[PDB]
Design a protein around this ligand. Structure first.
Ligand code: 4LU
Ligand code: 4LU
Ligand code: JQ8
Ligand code: JQ8
Ligand code: JQ8
Ligand code: JQ8
Ligand code: JQ8
Ligand code: JQ8
Ligand code: K
Ligand code: K
Ligand code: K
Ligand code: K
Ligand code: MN
Ligand code: MN
Lengths: 500, 500
């Protein structure tokens, strides 16, 4: 099976790429596997595959860390991501995001039901597993539980059957047959849960599939629109219908090649302790347990020699940056264009801990609008901060065409030099806020509201007559023939490879 | 003579360090020398010494570019700066700034007058030079003149004789015997000029010395207090009295080993076209000529085989970042401590284009103050933004003890995650602003006023009971014995030198 359509194939692909380290000696899921993965993520090293995990029994389980993290070279920096999508390993971020957005103006390709698959190779009923006896990792020393779920896909369906959502949300082991996790507004798992809670008759049928097709986990991490079934969007994106098998204990469908599947229910009434967890912004607040949603597990099915993917998330750079930030930025780009705003590109700078999105403006189009900073900032912020795709983002930075928003140095330069604090900014206090940011949930104000800003790093003439500066840099402050002379004589004179 | 006390010796020191490229083939001062230097600065390469400059005659002049720019290795990143100060080349920024602040609580060591020096080896009277025939560089393609003065020291004295100021301010050739340049508030050259203009009797006696003692050019770039003679501060800092010779045509004193000295007057009445110039924030606005101050040159004296230092300034990283930003930050640290604020360290992040200063707070001391963010932000901003040392800085970022303010990634992390936009910030509109920042002088508001902010990246418990988080990083989220195990087994497992 192709790497983008089968996680087991993806793992081979990383090997083939010389992007995997197989660790065949015993590694402890209590902190060690996550510590190694954390080091990998902070240094852009090869992904670790833990083949000998202390506590693995009867095939459950191996761990792959850092599945969507960065490579060290600049030329294939995003190669792990490209390998989720059938793209060349040298693909740019623009290319990856465009691939993720491509299905937005295509007919869905609905999934194909098949009678079996590798995820049915083994099974454990309600009398044969205990989630506290599996080698579930403790990811951070202060975590409030063992987070089994950092890179699987939750599957829930509206009560009317019309929308089946696939999404990533964290969950930890509560007891032998339950998890607790985040189910929060405005996320689709929460929107669907509220539909079942209003109906009031039963718990939500649920499945959690780990080691799904890589193209599916990418869409699981993306804020595609309300009511859109991720499986058909992934089908359209890949050009192929995904093969799904029915769960044994409910009528949901899971990818045929899923490594591990939990089947059960998400309660409409019960909660349990959840967190704290070392989170995407880089922090854990020890002892901040809150109540989360509660999941009951009725059955486990799994591949022979099953592999559990794991995100050891925190400080830069991991899946919570590369995927959450970038995929939100992609959706925000589209949303702005659909609202007739002249945005060409969007990216969440890693330097901002993916709390900012930089929006590149087509300033020829802006000029034709004959508008002003205040008016344009308000328009952009109203579109983005009132939408679910803007949930995680607290600062939007508007920049002109000379800025490559995928280059954080250039975004920082523009922000620092082109946006006058206060005057060039509009604050938004009456929008949904993201509590996970420390200055929100542990800050001075309401955890769930406000704290957002549009920072306009467009210069005044960009709205009127055109850019009126040149950069004081080698590229712009010297003519072409001189530049080339310098470059051609560089090593000759005594001064000091793309791939590496 | 020691490298910190003699520019010619400094140039040898860079050679010895394998930090110099000598270019002995002809190089054009029209753009080429500056283009090479610009490339050096953007890539942290070796400093270029142009020994065969097209237009050099009778010893005037060679050029040294990038005298205070960065080296490529992390271990000696600031080594050029350290070589201005007799510090080991591996000196940290903290060590450099502490050296620069050390004279602040020492008695001055006034300079020693000597009868001659190398700067008297050659001379040109009022009938024998023409500044338009020297090989003055065109530094950026759109500059409004040839900027002779990018790394020399202006020398002016109060009318009462009590204060002799040394400072860097740009100047360009106006005609055969005049320069024009920036003389702007609140700078000391401007404060002294205003004293002479109020007296109304004569132009200001002036000298401009190029290739001065490196320790002197560093103090020239630092906002030491009003009324403090830089020569005695440098004397105290170095432990040695500087040797100075009298000018021939006036009674000012110049460093004995200066490479090139201009003697003349700074007018109290005349102005001429000045700029535009590719400036420290990374921009040039072509055609934005303004009127600047006007200098008359009466005499030139110079060393045999004189060398002119040059800053090819603009985008990161050059002297306008390493020296202006860092030295302002140093002075701001001291100023805050003298105002009883619990600041331990200050640095202007390069990523901010040196428009921010991050202030590290001793949070044990803060806790004892029993204050709040709003009150503390206001206090800090009132101290800094009302003082000359705060002139160039538009954003102050307050961070707690876990943040190394000399590491821009960590400052950015804290700012992005700990300061809630709007709520955690205080804007200052009734303070002097820095017009050079594009969003000031070419922006939407007054060029000279406001646009400043204090951004509080202290978390709430830092004011009360203490930090209440751990970072989600390898350092903080894993115990010591595990961390060391990981590190000790890193290369064994398959994963991947300080000097490099
Ligand atoms: C890549 C990724 C995405 C996580 C995520 C993680 C990763 C690795 C974790 C598991 C390591 C840490 C926390 N995660 C959560 C999360 N969204 C959320 O509601 N709760 C979460 O706990 N997300 C983001 C979420 O997947 C996106 O917001 C999707 O848009 C949600 O899908 P939906 O639009 O269908 O609701
Ligand atoms: C290192 C350095 C410092 C420049 C400088 C440059 C460099 C390389 C240039 C020449 C390349 C670009 C512009 N410069 C100017 C400047 N200050 C100023 O008033 N006008 C300037 O034109 N400065 C900053 C100035 O030297 C500091 O603000 C000092 O504190 C001034 O000394 P003072 O406190 O005695 O007034
Ligand atoms: O645990 C965390 O890092 C988280 C989270 C989250 C929640 C909603 C949307 C995106 C990320
Ligand atoms: O209660 C919510 O709405 C929430 C939340 C949350 C918690 C942790 C990380 C991200 C969001
Ligand atoms: O109810 C509140 O004020 C709260 C909260 C919140 C939610 C998630 C994470 C952190 C704080
Ligand atoms: O020409 C520029 O880059 C400049 C400048 C300046 C002026 C005052 C204080 C610091 C820098
Ligand atoms: O007119 C002033 O006060 C000024 C100024 C200035 C110009 C260029 C760069 C920095 C400051
Ligand atoms: O008088 C003004 O408004 C002005 C100005 C200014 C000064 C220096 C640089 C840019 C603008
Ligand atoms: K999704
Ligand atoms: K602006
Ligand atoms: K000075
Ligand atoms: K704060
Ligand atoms: Mn969805
Ligand atoms: Mn001074």
């Amino acid at each position: 099976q192709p790497a983008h359509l089968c996680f087991r194939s993806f793992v081979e692909a990383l090997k083939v790429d010389n992007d995997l380290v197989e660790i065949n000696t015993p590694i402890d899921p209590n902190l060690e596997a996550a510590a190694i993965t954390r080091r990998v993520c902070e240094t852009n090293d090869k992904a670790p595959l833990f083949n000998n995990l202390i506590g693995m029994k009867n095939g459950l389980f191996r761990i792959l860390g850092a599945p969507g993290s960065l490579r060290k070279s600049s030329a294939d920096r995003y190669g792990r991501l490209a390998r989720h999508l059938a793209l060349p390993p040298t693909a740019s971020m623009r290319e990856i995001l465009d691939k993720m957005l491509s299905a937005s103006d295509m007919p869905p390709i609905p999934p194909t039901i098949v009678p079996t698959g590798p995820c049915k190779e083994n099974s454990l009923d309600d009398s044969e597993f205990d989630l506290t006896e599996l080698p579930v990792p403790l990811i951070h020393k202060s975590d409030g539980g063992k987070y089994i779920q950092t890179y699987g896909m939750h599957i829930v369906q509206s009560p009317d059957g019309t929308w089946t959502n696939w999404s990533i949300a964290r969950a930890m082991v509560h007891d032998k047959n339950h998890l607790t996790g985040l189910v929060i507004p405005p996320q689709h798992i929460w929107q669907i849960h509220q539909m079942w809670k209003k109906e009031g008759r039963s718990d939500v049928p649920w499945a959690l599939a780990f080691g799904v097709p890589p193209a599916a986990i990418m869409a699981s991490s993306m804020p595609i629109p309300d009511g859109v079934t991720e499986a058909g969007y992934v089908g359209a994106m890949t050009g192929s219908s995904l093969e799904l098998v029915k769960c044994d204990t409910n009528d949901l469908y899971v990818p045929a090649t899923s490594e591990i599947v939990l089947e059960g229910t998400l309660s409409i009434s019960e909660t349990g302790p959840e967190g704290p967890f070392g989170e995407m912004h880089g922090y854990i607040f020890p002892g901040d347990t809150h109540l989360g949603a509660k999941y009951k597990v009725n059955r486990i099915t799994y591949r022979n020699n099953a592999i559990m993917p794991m995100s050891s998330c925190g400080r830069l750079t991991d899946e919570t940056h590369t995927m959450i930030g970038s995929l939100a930025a992609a959706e925000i780009r589209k949303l702005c264009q659909q609202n007739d705003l002249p945005i060409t590109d969007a990216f969440a700078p890693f330097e901002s801990q993916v709390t900012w999105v930089a929006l590149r403006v087509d300033t020829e189009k802006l000029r034709a609008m004959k508008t002003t900073s205040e008016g344009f900032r308000k328009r952009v912020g109203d579109v983005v901060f009132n939408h679910k795709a803007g949930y995680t983002i607290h600062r939007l930075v508007l920049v002109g065409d000379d800025i490559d928003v995928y280059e954080g140095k250039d975004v920082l330069w523009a922000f620092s030099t082109r946006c006058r604090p206060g005057m060039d900014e509009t604050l938004f206090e009456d929008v949904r806020g993201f509590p996970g940011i420390p200055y929100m949930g542990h800050g001075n104000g309401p955890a769930h509201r406000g704290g957002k800003v549009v920072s306009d790093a467009l210069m005044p003439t960009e709205y009127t007559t055109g850019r009126n500066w040149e950069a004081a840099d080698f590229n712009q402050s010297y003519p072409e023939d001189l530049k080339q002379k310098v470059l051609d004589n560089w090593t000759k004179m005594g001064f000091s490879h793309h791939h590496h």
